[PDB]
Amino acid sequence: QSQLKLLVTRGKEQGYLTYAEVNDHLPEDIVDSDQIEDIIQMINDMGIQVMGRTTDPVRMYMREMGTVELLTREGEIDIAKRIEDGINQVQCSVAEYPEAITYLLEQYDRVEAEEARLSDLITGFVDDPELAREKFAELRAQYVVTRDTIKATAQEEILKLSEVFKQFRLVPKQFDYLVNSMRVMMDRVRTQERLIMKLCVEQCKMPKKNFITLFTGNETSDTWFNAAIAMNKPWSEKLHDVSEEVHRALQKLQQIEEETGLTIEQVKDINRRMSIGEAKARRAKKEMVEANLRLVISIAKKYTNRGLQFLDLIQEGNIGLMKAVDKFEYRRGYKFSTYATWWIRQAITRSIADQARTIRIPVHMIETINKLNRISRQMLQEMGREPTPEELAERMLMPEDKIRKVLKIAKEPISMETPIGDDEDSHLGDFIEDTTLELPLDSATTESLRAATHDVLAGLTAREAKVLRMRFGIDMNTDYTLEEVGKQFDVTRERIRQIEAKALRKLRHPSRSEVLRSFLD
């Protein structure tokens, strides 16, 4: 029951505290400068020092993942089941979209027309170029049979269309683009819907209760528009003012029913269904990862000192675990533990191979270095001192002259702030000389040489000076070709080339040449 005594007690038992900790606990009556700055002196006379949540995320992450309940052998099957139920739902949602099929057919029309490759359009269906060329025709056939049924008999063929479209394993990029296209189309639908909506409720003064009444099921026709406004309602006669805008913007709304080959009613349903599926999927998968977060740490504890931080390792490893959850199928019976282990380890190793170096080197380089490091172990005490630098790669399958270069670039650069001898503020980089700088003496000699050469060029004839300056970059930008010189000089060719040699001779004699001679040091 004292504030000060608490401050000093912490600062006595520990002995040792920081400015902030002292500022945290201060007498009720001390808020100001001399009332603290002196209290420090008071404290720094006895027990002298001056300078839950522990911060460092190594803790917080460990605790936050420490919450998550470990799975059960059967629970994994539950979650994976939720996954299966989730995904293939959005796959079916894709298969029920006409533009999704037509896009595939058109892109394949581009494939056979040599405007693109197969690898970009497919990974193979349930599995050959010929088999592909045929199976694709099967798909096209099941499309062209359902295309003419648009007239209650079509719901039967649409099933089989979905079936054959589902048999295709699309390139992930393409599938992504398809889903994107669908959702974007939905966003357009919402553009028109909201535009029409705000011209009634937000402007024209009319309830959303009555607005959606005749809206659902048509929205394209004038049943809710031309057959409505005459109804003698308080919100009815107000609809005349904007009646132009809505009717003009309705065209695109019914145009979507053409482009997508689906009524506005159906579109929203399909895309919403797909959203539900996707959400379900991710919802299960995350839950799968969070349970296995421990394995990642257990693996990462091996790779600690390789030049990456602990949390970096566990995060890259977490990404690996995510990949494992994405590519895993419980139907194969493979234990998820021993499976995902390799994935996490792979992500870790592959990442360390990359970002642990100031100068990043290719993977095969790292491996090639590793092998040499291993060979140099066995011959260490075997040779009595160490194997000669030119005896390593003999056992390696390469020209063997690499050992030098490989041993050279591999060494990491030394910290420029590394303390050098004398233990003073002297640091390594402080002794790094600037070579790229042009010393002032030389920079002066250059100016003097400019003036000198100018003077020597002032002695020749006007045309000799002009042509000799033109042959070089003297007092001009971009020294000109011997033909160009003539082009500017009128008379051309072998003429100019002569004057050059005629100038040099006149400047060769130790009268005009003696001045700049000493520059030849």
- Choosing from 13, 69, 115, 422, the residue that interacts with another protein (CB under 8 A) is 13
Q: Least CB distance from residue 12 to another protein, whole Å?
A: 9
Looking at residue 374, its amino acid is R
Min separation Cβ 31 and another protein, Å: 9
Nearest distance from C-beta of residue 27 to another protein, angstroms: 5
Closer CB to another protein, 39 or 403, in the complex: 39
Stretch that binds another protein, among 3-11, 63-71, 133-141, 464-472 (CB under 8 A): 3-11
Counting residues that bind another protein (by CB under 8 A) gives 20
Half-sphere exposure of 119 (CA within 13 A, CB side): 0
Q: Which is nearer to another protein, 27 or 389 (CB)?
A: 27
DSSP string of 62-76, one letter each residue: HHHHHHSPP--HHHH
Taking the complex as a whole, how short is the minimal distance between the CB of residue 58 and another protein, in angstroms?
22
Listed in sequence order, the residues at least 6 apart from 3 whose beta carbon sits closer than 8 Å to its beta carbon are 25, 26, 27, 28
Quick note: the x/- pattern for another protein over 110-129, rule CB under 8 A, is --------------------
Looking at beta carbons only, is 40 or 363 nearer to another protein?
A: 40
Q: Rank residues 11 and 86 by Cβ distance to another protein and give the closer one.
A: 11
Q: Locate all alpha helices (DSSP H) within 199-263, ordered by sequence.
A: 208-211, 243-259
Task: Report, in Å, the least distance between residue 14 CB and another protein.
Answer: 7
Question: Is the distance from CB of 261 to CB of 98 less than 8 angstroms?
Answer: yes
Given the complex with another protein, which of 13 and 424 has the nearer CB atom?
A: 13
Non-local CB neighbours of 412 within 8 Å, separated by 6+ positions = 357, 358, 359
**Residue entry with tokens 């060494």:** 411
**Nearest approach, Cβ of 48 to another protein (angstroms)?**
10
Q: 215-247 in b/e burial notation, b at 16+ Cβ within 10 A?
A: beeebbeeebbeebbeeeeebeeebeeeeeebe
Of the pair 51, 437, the CB lying nearest another protein is at: 51
At its nearest, how many Å lie between another protein and the CB of residue 29? 5
Nearer to another protein, 3 or 488 (CB): 3
Which segment (4-12, 140-148, 199-207, 437-445) binds another protein by CB under 8 A? 4-12
Q: Which residues within the stretch 14-73 sit at the binding site for another protein (CB under 8 A)?
A: 14, 27-30, 35, 38-39, 41-42, 45-46
Min dist. Cβ of residue 16 to another protein (A): 10
The residues, ordered by sequence, that sit 6+ positions from 285 with a Cβ below 8 Å of its Cβ are 83, 325, 326
CA angle, residues 353, 358, 361, in degrees to nearest 5: 45
> Does residue 460 contact residue 504 with C-beta atoms inside 8 Å?
no
198 burial (CB, 10 Å; 0-12 / 13-18 / 19+) is: middle
Q: Which is nearer to another protein, 3 or 498 (CB)?
A: 3
Residues engaged in binding another protein (CB under 8 A): 2-5, 7-9, 13-14, 27-30, 35, 38-39, 41-42, 45-46
